[PDB]
Amino acid sequence: GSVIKKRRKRMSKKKHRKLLRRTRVQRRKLG
Amino acid sequence: PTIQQLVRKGRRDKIAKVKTAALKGSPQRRGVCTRVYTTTPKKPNSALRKVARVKLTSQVEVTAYIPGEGHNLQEHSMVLVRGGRVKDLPGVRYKIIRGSLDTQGVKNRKQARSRYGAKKEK
Amino acid sequence: GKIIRTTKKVKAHDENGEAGIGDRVSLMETRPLSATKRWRLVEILEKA
Amino acid sequence: TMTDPIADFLTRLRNANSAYHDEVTLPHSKLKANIAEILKREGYISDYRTEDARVGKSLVVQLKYGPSRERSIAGLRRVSKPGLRVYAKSTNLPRVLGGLGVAIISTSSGLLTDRQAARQGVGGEVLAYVW
């Protein structure tokens, strides 16, 4: 299989992890 | 799968996507023209498509396409809307019926008149 | 089309209660003796 | 483990047939011997016999090939299998190859073919198809 699919999945995962890191304290305080 | 797997879980059919959810099970709906304007199609084509914003009786705000050459629609105009997709416009799934309620049949049409609400010449 | 084995619980009535747990018994239907009680113990087929 | 001896017999027959073997050996049982009898009487195999093995008895089946080395069996399928078993009434008996094949049916009168069962008006379990 082409690595293009892995690249799309990894970019989605990386962006989501960045978003989670950017709002850790906000999530902790709202939950 | 195994027959036992089938008798344990069975087969679940694919779900059906509801089309033209604003009509609510009716062939047509009556609406009022929220705003009447023009807009441009997708990139491969180019024109000034005539599109109206209609508030239906199902309390759904819907954008509808006006077929034919010329139209006389303005604000607060009662129109009768039907289902139909326009490939160029991204999210337009409805068309205004010509010759019904306020919207008028087009002028000087002699072929496919019934599709544009033009009466036969006397 | 596969043959399926299914299980069901009924409540029977025996006066003296000679039937323990695990005994193969015989039952016959009858009129409602209470709520949910609709069977009558005929006799104990084999004890266990 | 071994679940279907009949299916194993049918697959031994099929594998030997595809490899043009003239002989196939398998452990013996009454059911296997009876379907072997039906196969021989219907002309699908040459002949069969039972020897004695180290523990029990064996089944020896001779495969029939034509003069030009063409197989006398075109297919062997197991219909009723453990799990999903198949029973047919005397009226809805299956047809194999539009009647050109033979369907083995286990009736209370023994092992019969579809035509025999239809003539005698009995049903049973559809063991296999031969064509």
Add this chain to the structure above:
RNA sequence: AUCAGCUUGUUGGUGGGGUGAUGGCCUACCAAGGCGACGACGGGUAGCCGGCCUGAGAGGGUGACCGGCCACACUGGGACUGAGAUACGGCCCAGACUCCUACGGGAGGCAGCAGUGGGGAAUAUUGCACAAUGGGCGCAAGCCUGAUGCAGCGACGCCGCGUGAGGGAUGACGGCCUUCGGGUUGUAAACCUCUUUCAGCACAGACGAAGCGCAAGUGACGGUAUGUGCAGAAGAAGGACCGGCCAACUACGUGCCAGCAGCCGCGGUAAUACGUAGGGUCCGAGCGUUGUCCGGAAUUACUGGGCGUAAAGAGCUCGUAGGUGGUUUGUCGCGUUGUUCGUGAAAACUCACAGCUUAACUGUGGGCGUGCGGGCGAUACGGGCAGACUAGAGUACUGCAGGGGAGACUGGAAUUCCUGGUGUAGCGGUGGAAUGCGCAGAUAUCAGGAGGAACACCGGUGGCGAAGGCGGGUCUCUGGGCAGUAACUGACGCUGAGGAGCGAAAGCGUGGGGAGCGAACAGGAUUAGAUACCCUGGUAGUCCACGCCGUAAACGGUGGGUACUAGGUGUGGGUUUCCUUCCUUGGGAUCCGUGCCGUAGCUAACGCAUUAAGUACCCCGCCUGGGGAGUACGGCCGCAAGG
């Protein structure tokens, strides 16, 4: 189940009560049960069926008319009367709403038939008669019946008929195209005969009524259907489409506009795709569009699909419920199978016949009603019961190979540091340099000491382990495998939803340790810029103890068990016959592994191919176009990261 617990008259007993009747139906006492992953308890949606539509069938969708059952009658309770009560046009109470009132109080219930307003895309007359059928009362005549029989309106549907028929030409006019010749409309028209369906006019005029009535009469439909005369082709055709799918092409106008479009896609001054005209095709009192369902779709695959690389094998095991199960004897007749009886309303469907002028439609007689219940028959297979056997499975005994695991102790090389000699001016690093170290004595060399981590050669596509993974040596404890004998048990097997356990690295907690390496972080360099690659330093971490986490390209991208299907050649473990020196991979045979090459076969191909991705059987997991997204929400687990 992004709803796992629910139940206290709740489960059972006894005595009473109650009822037409059994019964926690009610009650007192007694006992503590009952239901639930075969999904209780919740949430959503829904009148059910004969049937109807679709489909080759299986199946999918649906419950309009007609027919059966159910529930309700402004909303919510309640009884009364009665043989019988959700009591639609009954009662009592409460409530909302509408109306009358002298203010004290009263009245009402179209989801009966018409009708009105409103909602909506959208659905009809405030009609005629009890003549026929059914019903109530009456001895009866008779009375009542918006049930019913009819009529009115709506192409709303199905069916049928008409708008004419025959003849008519080097083929009129006109239109359109043109190569300017002519061609097409076109036998079409005009004209000459013929017939008049249905409409129009006149006359006659029903059956439905072996009925009702002891009166003399009695048909709502209806003076309708129908029949017979009269006149005259006379009063009667539109819609969609024509690039391909998919029958049917030219001209003019316009030009990325105006527009078309179900998809592919057509509009850029010469468009068979836009608009209009000729021509054509398909249908025809219809023709198109929209909405909804089935088909095509084998696209949820029981019939009838898949999972190496296209979406799809859980990271791996153990094991619960369940599913499934070797050879053989007897028995049962549960499944299975044959026959018979009852039932499966009518209608519908299908076959045949009959009646409407035909058809739709109607009737009659079969079939169907794929099912269930009772009797009787069979025992091949499945199952149960009672046995038997040893080929599966396990044990025993004798050998064998191994980095399998845990603990303790311990060895040497090397790196670093510290101390002491010798010893000088550079060392270090790179593609090239600079930061950096050294001149306070560095690097180099020698001796001594401290500490931590990893174990060169052996050492490989070789061994072991379920997988992750596992090699310095020794000792202790411990798991599995294989071979031979076949002594023992006698199907004890396989798989396994959930569940439990193990599970690289990174990471987390507490306490130690810290030589080398080294995220982060500092400088140096390169560069247009270097939050990098390169250099010099360097903290967590890497290590140990005890616990968390629970993921990986956890891959052979290949779940487990079993049987069968050409061979050739390496290599690991073990038993054995023959060349025999018996030294020797001598060679063979056999059992268990691990590679390569290759048939048949399979696959879209690549490839797989006895270690299958071949041929089959049993069980499990998973897939259903791509994004959104393994994300949000809810939940569970976790210290957190997060899963």
Add this chain to the structure above:
RNA sequence: UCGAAGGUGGGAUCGGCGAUUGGGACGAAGUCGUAACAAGGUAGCCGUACCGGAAGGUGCGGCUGGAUCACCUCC
């Protein structure tokens, strides 16, 4: 006694709005960079951790779905 409606109370559950705020999809021509595909010019990807305007960089372990190995003298 039971008992509709009504009243009081504390919770369940389903939705709408919400100042502000997060990400997603699409958009010929805007700005910043070159990350991937040829060894894509530091092989790529997987889990994890840290860091950075951004693609991304680095450490640790893993995978091949990674390219090239000329000449190579004895036989």
